[PDB]
């Protein structure tokens, strides 16, 4: 996260760390959506252009964390994966369209003050909240500049009108993406960066006061570059797929 601040303890209890077993390294962010399921970006796991193809046995999921590097002894919980599901139509060849993946944990984690699932949006929550100018929140242990934080970072960013998103890049934007960030003139800065991919973009509903995950950190061109924006997977547009796989098994 670029231009963010230290998260408070328990501020983002759904934040998950994707951790490579060998060598030990932070791969990406992710989010807890139930006691058994984790949501992340497909490109965190599968990206042929760079020979990235992680399987369940290559990874660990660490939940309840605050410190990036420290093993938080009686606080965090580390889980193994049972199965990884990548959207069948994830488009890694062109523009990372449908950049989403689900990971089923080997066994349920117990919730605590530091571990708690985020809500997935329904049709009306998505309709009311996904509007240009409305701010969402991004969290992660990614780089601070285009070096690394000691603690989870947080930044609040406004959703940007689709026309300006599409006019800031040569990449083809689809309905399964939205972009967010401040415009050059607005004075305020902030963006996700390397290491933040797969993490949650969340919004707090003013109707029932719950946090909903509206997006997944997907891609950007550099980090916090003026006139450029972060792109996020549109979680609600892909909820049918999400429900399908959790229903299947």
């Amino acid at each position: 996260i670029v231009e963010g601040s230290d998260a408070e303890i328990g501020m983002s209890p759904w934040q998950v760390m994707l951790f490579r077993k060998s060598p030990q390294e932070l791969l990406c962010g992710a989010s807890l959506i139930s006691d058994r399921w984790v949501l992340t970006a497909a490109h965190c796991l599968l990206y042929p252009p760079w020979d990235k193809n992680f399987t369940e046995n290559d990874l660990l999921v660490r939940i309840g964390k605050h410190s990036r590097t420290r093993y938080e002894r009686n606080i965090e919980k580390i889980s193994m994966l049972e199965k990884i599901y990548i959207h069948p139509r994830y488009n890694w060849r062109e523009n990372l369209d449908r950049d989403i993946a689900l990971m089923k944990l080997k066994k349920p984690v117990a919730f605590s003050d530091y571990i708690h699932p985020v809500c997935l949006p329904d049709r009306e929550t998505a309709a009311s909240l996904l509007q240009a100018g409305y701010k969402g929140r991004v969290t992660g242990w990614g780089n601070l500049k285009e070096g690394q934080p000691s603690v989870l970072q947080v930044v609040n960013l406004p959703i940007v009108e689709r026309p300006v998103c599409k006019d800031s890049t040569r990449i083809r934007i689809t309905d399964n993406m939205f972009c967010a960030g401040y415009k050059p003139d607005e004075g305020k800065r902030g963006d996700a960066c390397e290491g933040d991919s797969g993490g949650p973009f969340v919004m707090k509903s003013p109707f029932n006061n719950r946090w909903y995950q509206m997006g997944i950190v997907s891609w950007g061109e550099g980090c916090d570059r003026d006139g450029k924006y972060g792109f996020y997977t549109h979680v609600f547009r892909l909820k049918k797929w999400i429900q399908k796989v959790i229903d299947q098994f």
Binding site: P158, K204, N209, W211
Partner: peptide, 26 residues
């Protein structure tokens, strides 16, 4: 069912340091 309500914040009626910024943007 209990989703989106943080043990250390919503459940205890405590607000985090910047959530008002979000609500004020709606």
């Amino acid at each position: 069912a209990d989703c989106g309500l943080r043990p250390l914040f919503e459940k205890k009626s405590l607000e985090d340091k910047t959530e008002r910024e979000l609500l004020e943007s709606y």
